[model samples]
Target: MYEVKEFSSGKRKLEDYKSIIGEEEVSKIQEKAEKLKGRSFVHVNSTSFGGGVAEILHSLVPLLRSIGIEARWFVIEGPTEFFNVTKTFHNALQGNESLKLTEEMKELYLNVNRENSKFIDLSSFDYVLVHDPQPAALIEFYEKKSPWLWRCHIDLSSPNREFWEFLRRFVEKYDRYIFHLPEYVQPELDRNKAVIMPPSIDPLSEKNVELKQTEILRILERFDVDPEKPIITQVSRFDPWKGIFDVIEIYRKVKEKIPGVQLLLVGVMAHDDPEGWIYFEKTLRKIGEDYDVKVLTNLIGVHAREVNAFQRASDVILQMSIRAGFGLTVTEAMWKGKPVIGRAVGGIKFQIVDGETGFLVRDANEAVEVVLYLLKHPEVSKEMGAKAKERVRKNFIITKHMERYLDILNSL
Candidate 1:
């Protein structure tokens, strides 16, 4: 009953990165990409919008094509019952408390993938990437000549044992498995077949590009946000693992120390994630009549331009994820040269260098301490922000991401 969705491919020149990254680096990428000429790739995932996977693919697919490689992105379709089962898988993989998947749920998950497999032509590409657990079972039904790699973008350090074993039955068949951080690789997985590839942000994207001050102010005005106050913004999906409630608590403590501090909880709901609106409603109930706090979603916030404005206007960014695969928001805020206060978990640990680029706290109290310190010492905060931008420039940009993909393709 579900149709496979194919995204339109856009073109971007590799030379566009000459200024951000040195010409030498860009040249190296182009040379490597030249080796990949005429090769075909296909990236399959659950949703085309919302969450970090989509954000990375949006720019990645076009960049791959721009480099003389043939690339396409496709989304698998499923019903609410199927997504609810995957949501349970998502939570359990993150070490969050959730109901264990029943036998019926497992049957539903496999049945949905079997249905979608008929719609996709995996043999069309030289390499096929199956992202996350939602479509991990696709390879079980589709027999192909090309290599199939499973890209996992979640915290699997302490996954629920039973569920991990169940999901592993399908993914172990992949030619290779990719994880955002080395620590996320489970002991049960074959280390020889594993590759560690961190995520990156596109500097040219609407969300990361520089904006005029007037435009930033206009966007803030539209959202009723005061540019004068110290804005502490956390841009993430409305999920419990993101620590939305803990962010509210941290905001309260910071406000007690620094008056007129504003908190903006900005996020968007993903099509595959059915629990977003439910969690959002619960958070709203907790907020009740608070005037100082603002909760904005994609319906009101519009697109990436608004996100860029919000990061630029804010004094500090917060991403206190209790469990994270790799917090793209942390890198997004840091790329904008704003100091980020994030939890020391998953890939956030790799992005931040404590005291130099940004502070990594263990709990809400530690988060409040860092927030207050940054607020009090604007000079130190600004210096850290500058260093944070350099850290991203040296490590986490999209050019490096593309180069890594080229290397992987070359190896294959």
Candidate 2:
């Protein structure tokens, strides 16, 4: 665990995040957390290594501890088959293919959950924060004690009703629920049960910190990218919904006019979801014969900080997701003062102030056109990049997130 002192001094507690926040907001949350200090909290999720939830926990848990909160992180161990079902649910929630789970799949999912529940000491933690659907059902095992919050980190604009209903049984069991965007909340989930709490990026983590020029050059050279040629990069998991193939298609269109352009798709896969590897291979096959395209799979966790370096190093950051809870990469790139060309979807539209901080495109063709325009007009792009950085620092930093979580926890 990276200690809080490794980054900042002991002065800023999780509660101190509110110091930069509004006065009205600070007092409201401070009042709530005062009675909740020293309380034990546990964050339960499928994996401890990768993905947004784990990334958030990596920084949030430690910050919570630094603030005198006893917090613990627990990863529920399960078989690949169990994860496959949860992945299906995840995709279906994001308006993907129909998720028709068989009786066998259900039994496998529940059996694994039941087994993993035994491994976790649910009775100890005062508040059990369950992340996503993988271990969401485990809350049932601790019905009589503690409060549970279900953090849904996916786009649910058009979720599979059957799956939603199935999960609703478990969702109803939780005292409160968290969603990344307003659209993700279904009418069925009682409004009283839900809260719109967006995900966040930690500036202090390896994924979002400042990198030295030499360090940046080393990574660029290692990837065989030419510094002279303008770089168009997108950092995301190799998933269909994430629009990696579409990004390549868009890059191809741009390269037709501007020669020697390079496209970097850098992302790390999660062990909990077996489909990421399959999707990574699928993306590789799709990018076949495209020499300008570089796909770096299984990137390490610490490299996430360097992701900001790549964003700053690039001419433009592309985040074209068909469905996204919120593009943390977009915020990270913007924080690094890089103009982002992102898809106008989900929470991305919320972050991007069209023509100000960045440009938002509805499709790949539009994205390609925008990238070419930005490349031609470097001065305007730089201006937009400056605005992007300030917007992120003022709003999306993990410090803001820490305050929000502290407030919410204290409210209870």
Candidate 3:
């Protein structure tokens, strides 16, 4: 059920980030990790590519390796039926109460975990970190040898009672748990076991690196987008909770005020989230006619470079998620020095400093209002963007993320 996943995290040394985060910060991380040298960590998740978890591990694991820590990553595999069940778990845990798990679905989930656990020998690793609900049941099948921390990356503050109750049994077996915020921790669980941590973006990655203006214009033209017109962009996965329809609504209303405005939607069609394809198709049908709106995906060779260009070319970034678990796309845009207008939900609240870095909206109309104001007052937009980039440089960078992980391991 589980397989060792391979990814190439280029040479990322802590010293390289000194200019972005400061030399003292890098020195502090080196000190914290000094005691844990040679310690081993295994990160288990559901996918090898796509989504933020895989992206984070791509850099985090190698950074750990650079610090003399033995880091490994694994992904569990199964048929379409298993992912369908887990997709519902993803939805219900994010506050969808209508979806219920059947006995067969439960059995299939456990059986897959049981089979996958046979391949994972956890006797050597000092710590085991499990991500999300797809492989949460894995602990039930294997004998625990080390401290296992469940790293949940979703909003579980108002989870479906039935799904939460079933999953809680598996989750409780871990030594400690990690959530995006204190609010996301279940009240019934032991409060001391909860660790509050936020996700991060690699500033040096292909998606967030600095691109020349000519390169940005060239990339925009390649996508048939007008660099002269005011462009609004949204980068995220095609999920029901991501609020794709609401973004379309915001774009449509904004276009009325600025007729020359163009809307660009870029989504990552992840492997584990099979329903993403269905939602991707649904989004196109809702678009009806292309007009000035353009939709692109990795399925069309829209990789990290293309995504970076879109974020750079756009005047404003929108994250219209109904329920968010620290939207990495929001952080990616912020790191690129672009003001983001996002819903004040889940981890989005932690990233955006309201008027300082970006504006937080309660509805699509509010987002539309922010977009119009930013495009009209482009100077203010640039002011907020500089602040946004600085905010990310100080807090959301990978060095800070590595420090947090080292602190957690030291505590354990």
Candidate 4:
């Protein structure tokens, strides 16, 4: 069980959050949170252990509770085969299918959902917030008596028609739909009911908070990393969609120009994601020729504090994901006053201001160039880092995230 930590007053809690989020935004959300007090809201997702959805819930729910809102989280348990099915659904939804789903596959998906349904009392919650396509079928059992929102976290701008058509029936049953990117919503979706909500990083979390010089050195020693040489760090799950291979290629290009530079790829496997290990193995094999390149995926939980330190200690922070929900890692690094070199896609574009806060590249070549620029010009990079932190303070902080969440609850 996770130990509950009490919120320390006068340490940038709600009032400090209000100061950054603006009095108007805080006032609006506080009214909603107060009205919704004592009311229970449950968020159901595919997994409880890994991925961004669960991590966001970790911080968001507690913040809601601190503000007097009763927010809870639930996960749908499934077998390995069940996750494989969901993976296909995810790829198809991201427009990666070259085939169609069979009748048996459809039946199995429904059967699993039916079996899982018996474990939870769906009607007990006031607001039943179901996340992504995996647990989305929960809406079938949902009645209009309670509010339901289908939160889509993946890229849906170019979904397979057949996959979307199948999912649309279930989606239409929900009271509202939430998409990470506004452009991802199809024209057919109920525009009035759709909410474009961006994801956020918790400032006080072990993964994002400030680290001491001793702690940073301890992490470097644990990873057998030299603190003297410049390190280019990328913290992301080993997913193909995250462009781990592209990051490797960019590292190779950087090494060609600056042989002394090193690269650290830090991330962990999510319970529902089976492909991360396979991808990690492939990355290791490809980087086998280079001893300077390190792939760290064997660590989990508090062990990931090393990644936090790596980002804090790195010369350049890279997030070259093909697409990101919000690249909360980017925000996390930025909160520590580090410049994040990210792809110009999804929420990364929203968080990064090109050449000002951080560089947003279009391809691996551009990514390499930006990393080199940051490495060569420390003053310029430091200025960008300062801007990055300010940007996160004004927009991407957890307090602002909770404020938006409260507003949504109030509107409901």
Superposed by TM-score, candidate 2 places the C-alpha of residue 220 at a distance from the truth, in angstroms, of 1.1
By lDDT, the best candidate is: 3
Q: All models: lDDT?
A: 0.85, 0.77, 0.86, 0.78
Once fitted onto the true fold, the runs of candidate 1 whose alpha carbons sit more than 4 angstroms away are: 1-9, 49-51, 77-85, 95-124, 141-144, 239-257, 270-290, 299-303, 363-366
lDDT of 1: 0.85
TM-score, per-candidate, Cα-based: 0.84, 0.80, 0.86, 0.83
> For model 1, where is the 10-residue window of minimal lDDT?
1-10
TM-score of 3: 0.86
lDDT tens string, model 4, 3-74?
Answer: 223322222336546545578866766776788888877778786566667666766766677677677667
> In terms of TM-score, which candidate is strongest?
3
lDDT tens readout by residue for model 2, 1-412: 1112222222335554554445675565455556778888778788766566766776777767765677777777777777778878787766655678678877887787788887756766888788888887787775547777888888766888777777788888787889888888888778887888877766666777678888888877777767789899999877778888888898889999998889988887766656788888788788898778877655433265455566768998899888776777788888788888888888799999999998989888899888998999999989999998888766787766766677677667
Choose 2 or 3, whichever is better by TM-score: 3
In model 3, which regions exceed 4 Å deviation? Answer: 1-6, 77-81, 98-104, 140-145, 238-257, 270-290, 298-301, 363-369
**Per-residue lDDT over 117-225 for candidate 3, one digit per residue giving the tens place of the 0 to 100 score:** 8886764579989999988888877677789989999888899998999999999989989987878899868888889888788888888988889888888878799
Q: Total clashing residue pairs per candidate?
A: 0, 4, 1, 0
- Candidate 4, TM-score vs. the true structure? 0.83
